[PDB]
């Protein structure tokens with residue numbers, strides 16, 4: 016059970032750890048988060064109490080290194096840092112744990128929510144979408160643009176999601192214009208799966224990452240990518256049965272976790288109505304259709 | 316853009332453009348079968364591809380053989396239209412390729428955009444203009460070449476005949492749209508106006524009669540009267556009681 020200690024909490028802040036969150040007051044004796052489950056990637060996220068525009072965080076894996084948070088009063092944010100001295104890190108964590116200055120990752124035994132949201136998400140693949148190669152953890156925030164958004168500005172601070180464009184030479188074989196436009200199977204199976212992602216696991220990994228960045232940061236480009244990757248599958252007549260069954264599971268848990276009060280900002284009416292009621296896969300997403308009709312019937 | 320707020324003058328500038336109308340591509344007669352079901356029989360169609368500045372009409376004749384053994388024909392027709400317009404563009408020298416293609420129906424936008432991905436600098440635009448190009452098949456010589464075709468064929472026309480020798484493109488297009496609107500509204504009455512005077516003929520190489528400038532004014536007047544008469548018949552409106560502002564609005568409003 017790994018630990019992300021904090022030097023201190025000098026500014027009032029809402030701290031998220033995966034799907035959980037808590038409020039820390041200005042100069043509260045808060046020295047971080049313990050009992051973080053090994054075996055999954057995690058996200059620690061922040062929204063300042065005095066300025067809700069400051070919404071940002073770090074994807075990390077405690078298997079990769081010893082990570083801590085320290086507030087930087089110059090840049091005005093909680094920074095993740097790697098501690099290379101193992102024995103200093105263990106000694107600091109031990110003191111904070113003894114003084115009970117840490118909150119415990121509040122995982123219910125029965126509850127597979129986080130595994131279900133991150134099944135296909137790998138820290139090595141996140142570092143390819145978010146490249147700051149000197150760090151083992153990845154910073155994301157609410158404002159970060161995607162490579163596709165930057166084609167339609169700073170190339171270093173960008174989310175390198177795979178560009179999906181239904182009206183692109185990549186999506187449409189010369190001579191198969193109608194076929195490829197009405198049935199996205201070529202674009203999904205040959206261009207995206209065989210060509211770029213190599214396998215459905217990598218495709219689901221980016222889809223899941225895009226959803227999580229949309230939900231935790233309100234990252235608009237991430238929300239566009241999540242919907243484009245759903246629509247590319249739902250708009251294909253030919254999809255392996257294992258991929259349809261897994262997508263139904265993936266979306267079910269995403270729609271389950273989505274806080275109701277954010278459904279107006281995080282769900283695209285056109286895409287969901289098309290995917291569930293008009294697409295080739297309209298009858299293939301049984302679990303997703305049922306939770307969507309029961310939780311968000313207004314949208315549909 | 317589109318043509319929402321509208322500048323009509325853009326049609327007559329020196330940027331090559333084409334209107335594409337797909338309303339006559341897929342044409343059927345609906346009939347009863349022996350068992351008393353309903354079936355369709357396709358008849359020959361055409362793509363109406365017009366340069367409004369020059370009058371150049373690229374009439375691609377769509378032979379019924381295109382449809383043989385195909386499904387979802389109303390959908391396919393859009394894509395076949397887009398396939399043929401893209402083939403026409405690719406066939407033209409670079410200096411004759413259009414800068415814009417204006418589709419008369421919004422359903423043609425995606426098909427044409429997808430067929431023209433190789434031409435990112437050619438704008439594909441809709442129009443808020445309600446253009447009467449469906450009535451192309453009311454021009455006898457165009458209907459005749461379409462119905463006689465035994466195979467896919469392209470035929471070239473100047474839909475303005477020799478009018479540009481005497482009038483501007485703006486005025487030629489206005490005359491064409493008035494004539495096509497009248498043929499669309501009351502084909503029989505429109506043809507009687509055009510063809511009833513024994514002394515006025517259609518040149519072998521023309522589509523419309525050889526009217527003097529003064530005769531075109533009379534014909535134009537008679538066509539505007541036909542359109543207003545049919546609007547009164549349709550809506551049960553006493554037209555004899557309307558004003559010129561009222562009358563002017565009803566024709567262009569159309």
Ligand SMILES: COc1ccc(NC(C)=O)cc1
Pocket residue numbers: 370371372373471472473
């Ligand atoms: C062979 O390529 C062309 C292009 C345009 C035209 N113009 C007319 C008179 O319709 C004719 C031929």
